[PDB]
């Protein structure tokens, strides 16, 4: 398979080898602020990244991915709409071309400059491939990124960026705290959904926050001067790697928040 974001194997293509693609839960969503509606038996979210002990950093092709030790239950997610304990795995973003576009979830229809995705694994399911396979087998915490100030959090990893530019390269990326990259509230809204590129699975639980981050135009402009392609092969510069807004269908959005 050679999915990816350009015209010819992009978004739209990718029924076609992933039919659960025109599926009844995909991801993303706009988010109507408007019809969302409270609900008032979420319990309070708690994200405890305190032990989070990440590893690598690893371009894929697609996006960069910040991979944590996830062998025990060092950074979670629990609370909110969720059962149980979630293990965070992993971070990584989609962003644009121009900071009017990058996001995959929308909100009335406004594209953030790019979203933050923590991923988390359900732990009753004793493994990430058994989990993805589950209606319920991961949670991703979605943050939105707006340009404005620069964000001090993210710096390390925008200056780790030249040195995984091109697909398949990574480099050790230790003792990174994704408590960083947080907004100060942790309001949400929530909904169940899927994986937003190949294979499409329809498991994940979306908790995604109100609060955008701010980040600056040079840290965003370090993200575009990444590298689809692998090393030695030509330049296509890694931007517009997000999914545009699906049918919402048999669905509601839940907020945290009145
Ligand atoms: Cl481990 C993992 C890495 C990336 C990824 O990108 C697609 C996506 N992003 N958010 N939900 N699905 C999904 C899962
Ligand atoms: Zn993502």
Redesign the pocket.
């Known amino acids: 398979h050679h999915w990816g974001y350009g015209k010819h194997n992009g978004p739209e293509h990718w029924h076609k080898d992933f039919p659960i693609a025109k599926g009844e839960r995909q ?1 993303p969503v706009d988010i109507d602020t408007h019809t969302a509606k409270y609900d008032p038996s979420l319990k309070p979210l708690s994200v405890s990244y305190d032990q989070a002990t990440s590893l690598r950093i690893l371009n894929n092709g ?2 960069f ?1 910040v991979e944590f030790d996830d062998s025990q239950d060092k950074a979670v997610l629990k609370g909110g709409p969720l059962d149980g304990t979630y293990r965070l ?2 971070f ?1 973003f ?1 962003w644009g071309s121009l900071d009017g576009q990058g996001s ?1 979830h929308t909100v009335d229809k406004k594209k953030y400059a790019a979203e933050l ?1 923590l ?1 988390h694994w359900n732990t009753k399911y004793g493994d990430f491939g058994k989990a993805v396979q589950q209606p319920d087998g991961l949670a ?1 915490l979605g943050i939105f990124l707006k340009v404005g100030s620069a964000k001090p959090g993210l710096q390390k990893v925008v200056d780790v960026l030249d040195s995984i530019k091109t697909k398949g390269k990574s480099a050790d990326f230790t003792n990174f705290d994704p408590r960083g990259l947080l907004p100060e509230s942790l309001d949400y809204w929530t909904y169940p959904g ?4 190949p294979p499409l699975l329809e498991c ?1 639980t979306w908790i995604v926050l109100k609060e955008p981050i701010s980040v600056s135009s040079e840290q965003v402009l370090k993200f575009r001067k990444l590298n689809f392609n692998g090393e030695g092969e030509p330049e296509e510069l890694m931007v517009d790697n997000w999914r545009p807004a699906q049918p919402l269908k048999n669905r509601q959005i839940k907020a945290s928040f009145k």
């Open positions: 991801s697609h996006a991915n795995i992993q990584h989609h995959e995705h991923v991703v899927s994986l937003t590129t994940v």
